Design an enzyme around this catalytic site. Structure first.
Site, PDB file in Angstrom:
ATOM      1  N   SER A  82       0.829  -1.199   0.000  1.00 44.67           N
ATOM      2  CA  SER A  82       0.000   0.000   0.000  1.00 44.67           C
ATOM      3  C   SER A  82       0.872   1.260   0.000  1.00 44.67           C
ATOM      4  O   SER A  82       0.653   2.185  -0.790  1.00 44.67           O
ATOM      5  CB  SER A  82      -1.015  -0.035   1.122  1.00 44.67           C
ATOM      6  OG  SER A  82      -0.438  -0.115   2.410  1.00 44.67           O
ATOM      7  N   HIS A 108      -2.514  -8.618   1.800  1.00 44.38           N
ATOM      8  CA  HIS A 108      -2.065  -7.375   2.408  1.00 44.38           C
ATOM      9  C   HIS A 108      -3.031  -6.893   3.492  1.00 44.38           C
ATOM     10  O   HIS A 108      -2.582  -6.575   4.585  1.00 44.38           O
ATOM     11  CB  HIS A 108      -1.801  -6.295   1.354  1.00 44.38           C
ATOM     12  CG  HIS A 108      -1.093  -5.088   1.886  1.00 44.38           C
ATOM     13  ND1 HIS A 108      -0.434  -5.065   3.096  1.00 44.38           N
ATOM     14  CD2 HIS A 108      -0.923  -3.849   1.317  1.00 44.38           C
ATOM     15  CE1 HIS A 108       0.097  -3.854   3.272  1.00 44.38           C
ATOM     16  NE2 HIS A 108      -0.191  -3.085   2.184  1.00 44.38           N
ATOM     17  N   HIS A 163       5.836 -13.125   8.250  1.00 44.49           N
ATOM     18  CA  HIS A 163       5.961 -11.822   7.619  1.00 44.49           C
ATOM     19  C   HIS A 163       7.079 -11.851   6.583  1.00 44.49           C
ATOM     20  O   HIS A 163       8.012 -12.637   6.696  1.00 44.49           O
ATOM     21  CB  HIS A 163       6.249 -10.741   8.674  1.00 44.49           C
ATOM     22  CG  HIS A 163       5.873  -9.350   8.256  1.00 44.49           C
ATOM     23  ND1 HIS A 163       6.763  -8.440   7.735  1.00 44.49           N
ATOM     24  CD2 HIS A 163       4.646  -8.750   8.285  1.00 44.49           C
ATOM     25  CE1 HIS A 163       6.110  -7.313   7.469  1.00 44.49           C
ATOM     26  NE2 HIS A 163       4.796  -7.493   7.790  1.00 44.49           N
ATOM     27  N   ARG A 208       3.853  -4.121  17.307  1.00 52.33           N
ATOM     28  CA  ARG A 208       2.479  -3.668  17.111  1.00 52.33           C
ATOM     29  C   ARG A 208       1.531  -4.684  17.746  1.00 52.33           C
ATOM     30  O   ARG A 208       0.552  -4.300  18.377  1.00 52.33           O
ATOM     31  CB  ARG A 208       2.155  -3.461  15.620  1.00 52.33           C
ATOM     32  CG  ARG A 208       3.076  -2.507  14.867  1.00 52.33           C
ATOM     33  CD  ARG A 208       2.725  -2.449  13.392  1.00 52.33           C
ATOM     34  NE  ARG A 208       2.860  -3.735  12.709  1.00 52.33           N
ATOM     35  CZ  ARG A 208       2.508  -3.971  11.445  1.00 52.33           C
ATOM     36  NH1 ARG A 208       2.042  -3.004  10.677  1.00 52.33           N
ATOM     37  NH2 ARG A 208       2.633  -5.184  10.947  1.00 52.33           N
ATOM     38  N   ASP A 227      -1.872  -8.577  12.899  1.00 57.39           N
ATOM     39  CA  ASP A 227      -3.120  -9.117  12.383  1.00 57.39           C
ATOM     40  C   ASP A 227      -3.598 -10.302  13.234  1.00 57.39           C
ATOM     41  O   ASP A 227      -4.789 -10.636  13.238  1.00 57.39           O
ATOM     42  CB  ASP A 227      -2.992  -9.423  10.894  1.00 57.39           C
ATOM     43  CG  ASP A 227      -2.785  -8.180  10.040  1.00 57.39           C
ATOM     44  OD1 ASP A 227      -3.516  -7.182  10.274  1.00 57.39           O
ATOM     45  OD2 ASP A 227      -1.918  -8.221   9.137  1.00 57.39           O
TER      46      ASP A 227
END
Lengths: 435, 437
Positions: free
Chosen positions: B240, B270, B318, B327, B373
């Site tokens: 992105s 994504h 990843h 995160r 995620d």
């Protein structure tokens, strides 16, 4: 379809080659990266793979191995017209094979079945302010049709399989490619022709029907067929094709990917050079040559004044091309035939002669030669397409031929998500040995 | 504005550094490209430059030099709330400086002035079939507002100047960033909440007003502030951010560039992992554990069956990270505080313990650790955001903080059009020694 089965064969033959390069030769070095290149937009880094087309710096573009003269020579022609079926060029880009008459007709028939524009696309373009740029409308129209994505429905239904994923991607590519000209024409009519619309003629080919729906007579049908084929692909490293490739690499469907691509093509450094050349020629004719076609002499020195006063000749130079663009040459051949006496063409022609010698002397532009954008505008203008902003939409229709072919193949070959690594200025300073 | 003047100072200091690297050290080699990498999505090639954030494979993301604990610690907090002003994080990404309370308030005031959504954006989203995916609506809403681009009007008026171009780009970034939450909320209400709308509260900050307009009570305001900051940037090489950067490199404005970016973020590889994790946990709870929170024992072996039967644990692994995502850790700390007894969180927590040891053994994923995620969905679900497809829109709102900051800097530093070179399979075969006969 025969086309889909042919494509399945070509994929079966190609996949082992890709497998072998990864299995046996993965670590073979093909290029390096400098500080200059990382800062300067990956300039010249060999970091992308496509087989649809290849841009040679010296020879220019080849489509599936073929030169432009070869493509225009070998592709079946539309009955009653000078230029190939655009559908036949699409067949070539997808398969690598020149289609027979029988094979092109099958693609042309399939495009006829798929070319109708969803009503909600028109609703959406009407809800967008009419003063919206045509490339914004174009990208939005493509995006809205993401609702119809077969690839997205396939993925969302849990059916993803790396061997078969190209198949719904192909269906979306056929659906979108068939519709893009109608979308473009709709925008042209709604913005610039008093919002009256000429219906699709179901007996015309892609290029013929485009000219029909635009409201422009013969030989604009051939202008469009030629224009679209020339703009079909310029390998995968150009901003629009790369953007599509990048977006699709995350398994976004072709509607998301091509919408994104048109956002890039809209950029002044990518999709505007045609109109900027033409404006500059028209302003030159009016202000520097008192509204008249000059002598070779008068123009030769006009060029030198513009250059030595620190300004570019538009439509000359390129990031990758180092010789004359063969796309430019094909445009020239068309203009010589059909509009030799057009004042604007005459200036374009004379610029061809006088500008390369001069740019070569100064030795400052790495490509002292024309690209297509030096030629396209005088042809569009001649036939009454005066709406400069719309020229980029023509480009977007054309470029989908190669880009959508490329997305089908990206999925066929299972190319991985595009995800390079970033570095900071500090890290570059460290590598440079700065304190 | 103080922010714009501060940014102008930072640009004045930074430009000479970029000039020097190009003038003196242009030809210094920093990496190479192999056949594997050209075929494999430029994997690992150091070919992009950004200062907004830097993704360390071991430590994870740093925002302008700072870790996530540091950012959350140092940024001024919204009075009466736990989390920072998102506006303050935007100030940090733009300038490199942690803002004072005074400085954040100035940004918050500017966002209040810029947050209203053009009515034609609503008209456009209504003309789009209501069954359109929310990310398609989101990208379309951004794109439609390209009509308002100051950068595009600047360019079209013949005013482009390489020294000043960042200025209209900054104005567009402020305009777009202020509106993205309202756009998101509009889509949420129109699709999933019976098309009734809660007006903007002009006294709330970005995150607070987002929760307001979504119709979700405290502490969703803090959920959103945290969510947006964590998703703000992940250097420029993610699909992105790279898409935005690429599109803008042709001097397309931020609306074109960020719309394009959301087309990439919509991609299953994504922007979908949050909802895919959550669905997989909910299906696991229901079918493999008879609707109940399992033991560490029961789950340990459930994992092994899924893996050894040839399937991935979602939200683990990843392209670049090789350790635990910080995160993920920040999400965890929030969940421990606010929803320790939530059934879905308990499974997420236990997965944290059991899954890394197991993935490490099999030694097949290069990152045997969670990413964000793995954690985001249980938090959204807990607070009643059950609409899976919308999760990616949350991501898109957040990611604009870093991406728009990056576009301002791309223009400030005059970064050139991105234009790598393609090669054919034949050419790779030649280099490999299979061809040239």
């Amino acid at each position: 379809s025969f086309l889909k089965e042919k494509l399945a064969e070509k994929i079966a033959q190609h996949r082992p080659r890709t497998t072998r390069l990864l299995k046996e030769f993965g670590n073979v070095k093909i290029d390096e990266v400098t500080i200059s290149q990382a800062i300067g937009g990956m300039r010249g880094i060999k970091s992308l793979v496509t087989d649809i087309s290849y841009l040679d710096p010296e020879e220019g573009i080849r489509f599936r191995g073929y030169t432009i003269p070869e493509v225009l020579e070998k592709l079946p022609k539309v009955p009653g017209a000078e230029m190939p079926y655009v559908e036949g060029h699409f067949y070539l880009l997808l398969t690598g094979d020149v289609p027979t008459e029988k094979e092109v007709k099958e693609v042309a028939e399939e495009f006829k079945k798929r070319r109708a524009l969803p009503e909600y696309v028109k609703d959406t373009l009407k809800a967008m302010p009419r003063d919206t740029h045509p490339m914004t409308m174009f990208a939005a129209g493509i995006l809205a049709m993401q609702r119809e994505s077969k690839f997205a429905a396939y993925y969302n239904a849990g059916k993803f399989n790396k061997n078969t994923a190209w198949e719904p991607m192909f269906e979306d590519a056929m659906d979108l490619m068939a519709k893009l000209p109608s979308l473009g024409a709709y925008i042209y009519r709604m913005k610039y022709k008093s919002d009256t619309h000429i219906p699709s003629n179901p007996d015309l080919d892609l290029g013929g029907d485009f000219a029909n729906m635009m409201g422009i007579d013969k030989p604009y049908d051939d202008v469009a067929r030629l224009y679209f084929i020339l703009h079909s692909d310029h390998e995968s490293g150009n901003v629009s094709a790369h953007t599509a490739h990048l977006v699709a690499s995350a398994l976004s469907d072709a509607y998301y990917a091509y919408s994104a691509a048109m956002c890039g093509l809209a950029g002044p450094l990518h999709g505007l050079a045609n109109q900027e050349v033409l404006k500059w020629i028209q302003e030159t004719i009016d202000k520097k040559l008192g509204g008249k076609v000059p002598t070779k002499e008068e123009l030769k020195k006009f060029v030198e004044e513009t250059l030595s006063s620190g300004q570019v000749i538009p439509g000359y130079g390129h990031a990758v091309l180092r010789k004359t663009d063969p796309r430019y040459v094909a445009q020239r051949e068309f203009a010589l035939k059909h509009m030799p006496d057009d004042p604007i063409f005459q200036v374009v022609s004379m610029l061809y002669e006088v500008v390369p010698p001069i740019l070569s002397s100064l030795g400052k532009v790495k490509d002292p030669w024309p690209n297509v954008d030096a030629h396209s505008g005088c042809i569009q203008w001649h036939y009454g397409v005066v709406e400069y902003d719309f020229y980029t939409v023509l480009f977007g229709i054309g470029r989908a031929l190669g880009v959508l072919a490329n997305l089908v193949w990206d999925r066929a070959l299972g190319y991985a998500i595009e995800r390079p690594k970033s570095v900071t200025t500090d890290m570059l300073e460290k590598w440079a040995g700065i304190k």
